[PDB]
């Protein structure tokens, strides 16, 4: 004869849905502690700024400069407090920078002749005075002229440089001729292999922090041995340098969970989940070594025999 | 492995007995073993049949014009999904069939094993799936074998003499 237990567990099999067994173990992790641990991975909390805002140099998160990460946690309370802007490919720039894993900025020496630099707006108030993005340089006319800028910056290093620049779309034609001189501007940034030409569009837009105009953010990657030429006769938010680009295990996550001190291998927007089990049902968004996602709420593996109480 | 035939004409169940005593040849069908096999096959079918796929809006799978990366990626995704589910369909059918054959061959041996234990030292296995009872069995005695109420002690003395 064999043994039996008084309190068995119901387990699924090929023949039938329910068979009692002596004991079983759950194979789906359906619980979270509600907090994110920071020991095995580097967690960076973007409390009030998004990755793009930190990349661009928003006035209220200068703390994120030259900050590396293994996981950028984005909070739903993030807000922008600078000149209104848009990115034609927001998801591409967010993905590219997040996987880079470093907001490291090396300021190059850019010679702009015949223009006035360090422009600003009342929308970005750095302290009591009007300012701008710290990693973008606004160029205005110098007196009564905007000479056609033709700058160059070669590559002699062994890593890829990411250049973030922009085009300013002013609200009115008077604003364009007051800021720049040409009625219709043009910005062309080209490498030896790729070109990008953007003509600014004049028109009124919704009112954000006092500005009816916008800024369109673009990016260009220069490989080793390449060269970057910036040509524009107006409406150029010039770059101040380049961001070092690296490959590695780095991503961005949108969560509202707080960060605590523990050792958890995987991170989920609902918190950190244990990694012993093979499957999990907490969330489909994960970072690190964690179980696969299944639709099932429970899955029991039979660590025992049938449980008939009081081939063989 | 000892039954090497299938009794066509067994039309009241999947398993059963036939005997040749002094009264004459008879035929009967077992019902506990038959419904056990049918229940397990029925339970297997229900688990396979369950409908849990409910999809409303998906990507476009047929294309009229010729586009580039996006169209090719969509074709790659659907082809990958079809091959994976086609493989799952083959393995599932192959696995559940081999279990059905083994399930049905086991139920015959289980019936044979319990009939052997019933005739404790009153019968001899004869290679094929038939016993040789060494005492006079009437129709009632054969019925008690199928019912489960066969007393092996009343016939024991006369069976042991015939055996040896």
């Amino acid at each position, epitope marked *: 004869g064999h043994h039996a237990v008084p309190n068995g567990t119901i387990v699924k099999t090929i023949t039938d849905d329910q068979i009692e067994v002596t004991n079983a173990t759950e194979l789906v992790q359906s619980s979270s502690t509600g907090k994110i641990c920071n020991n095995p991975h580097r967690i960076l909390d973007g409390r009030d700024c998004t990755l793009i805002d930190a990349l661009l140099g928003d006035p209220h998160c200068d703390v994120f400069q030259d900050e590396t990460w293994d996981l950028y946690v984005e909070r739903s309370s993030a807000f922008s407090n600078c000149y209104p802007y848009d990115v034609p490919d927001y998801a591409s720039l967010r993905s590219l920078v997040a996987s880079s894993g470093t907001l490291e900025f090396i300021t190059e020496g850019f010679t702009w002749t015949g223009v006035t630099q360090n422009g600003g707006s009342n929308a970005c108030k750095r302290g009591p005075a009007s300012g701008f993005f710290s990693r973008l340089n606004w160029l205005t006319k110098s007196g009564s002229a905007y000479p056609v800028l033709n700058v160059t910056m070669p590559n002699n290093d062994n890593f890829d440089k990411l250049y973030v620049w922009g085009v300013h779309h002013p609200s009115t034609n008077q604003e364009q001729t007051n800021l720049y001189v040409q009625a219709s501007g043009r910005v062309t940034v080209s490498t030896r292999r790729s070109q990008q030409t953007i003509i600014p569009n004049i028109g009124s837009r919704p009112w954000v922090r006092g500005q009816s105009g916008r800024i369109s953010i673009y990016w260009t990657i220069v490989k080793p041995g390449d060269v970057l030429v910036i040509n524009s006769n107006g409406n150029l938010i010039a770059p101040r340098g380049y961001f070092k680009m690296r490959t590695g295990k780095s991503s961005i996550m949108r969560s509202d969970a707080p960060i605590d001190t523990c050792i958890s291998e995987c991170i989920t927007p609902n918190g950190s989940i244990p990694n012993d089990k093979p499957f999990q049902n907490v969330n489909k968004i994960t970072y690190g070594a964690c179980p696969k996602y299944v639709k099932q709420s429970t899955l029991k593996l039979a660590t025992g025999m049938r449980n008939v109480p009081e081939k063989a | 492995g000892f039954i090497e035939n299938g009794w066509e004409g067994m039309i*009241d169940g999947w398993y059963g007995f036939r005997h040749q005593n002094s009264e004459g040849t008879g035929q009967a069908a077992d019902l506990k073993s038959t419904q056990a096999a049918i229940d397990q096959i029925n339970g297997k079918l229900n688990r396979v049949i369950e409908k849990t796929n409910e999809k409303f809006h998906q990507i476009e799978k047929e294309f009229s014009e010729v586009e580039g990366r996006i169209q090719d990626l969509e074709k790659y995704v659907e082809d990958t999904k079809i091959d994976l589910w086609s493989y799952n369909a083959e393995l599932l059918v192959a696995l559940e069939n081999q279990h059905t054959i083994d399930l049905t061959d086991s139920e015959m041996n289980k019936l044979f094993e319990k009939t052997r234990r019933q005739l404790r030292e009153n019968a001899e296995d004869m290679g094929n799936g038939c016993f040789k009872i060494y005492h006079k069995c009437d129709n009632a005695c054969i019925e008690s074998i199928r019912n489960g109420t066969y007393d092996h002690d009343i016939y024991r003395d006369e069976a042991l003499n015939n055996r040896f």
Partner: antibody
Amino acid sequence: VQLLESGGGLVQPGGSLRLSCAASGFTFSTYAMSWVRQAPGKGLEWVSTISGSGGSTYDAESVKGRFTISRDNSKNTLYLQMNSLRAEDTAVYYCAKEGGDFWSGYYANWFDPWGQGTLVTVSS
Amino acid sequence: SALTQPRSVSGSPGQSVTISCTGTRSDVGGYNYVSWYQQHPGKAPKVIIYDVKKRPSGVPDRFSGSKSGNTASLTISGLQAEDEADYYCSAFAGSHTLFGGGTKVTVL
């Protein structure tokens, strides 16, 4: 599908009675059939069942040696024979059909159609 | 012997009612041939649930069945006036069919 019962009536104790259930609307030789009785005011009690070919018959213990079951697949009629009737046999007798279509013809796991029933009574 | 069923179960309209049919290991726990029949007064019984959790064609989806070891349960959801009848449970015991005592459902 329609099952019609007949033969119910008053019989003295120890008497005999024969009930016929005429079935139309389905292949009678494919499906198993059963007799189920319900005493007046009490619950349901199974009586007998028969296979598709009629070779296998199953009876309840309180009925085993007394009542027998039979079929005539040519006439599509199901017959139950009462031989020794007691005071506890007064009930309404239904003829039922195996409602399953999975290897039908062996046993009645459930009874999809039921007849209106025939009432048999025993008394002095 | 016979299956055990409660004498009566009552529930207010719109509620849920569960009927328990407790059997042995050869009746309910040995097979999946449990069936439920509804008998209105003076009428022949009709099937509501054949095979533990299956319904015929022509029965409201309110009715549901389940099995837990040796006890089989029938759940009536959205209880209403036309559900007031006697409910019986059937099981297969290897060599015979067993019927329950009978539970009378009353709607408040």
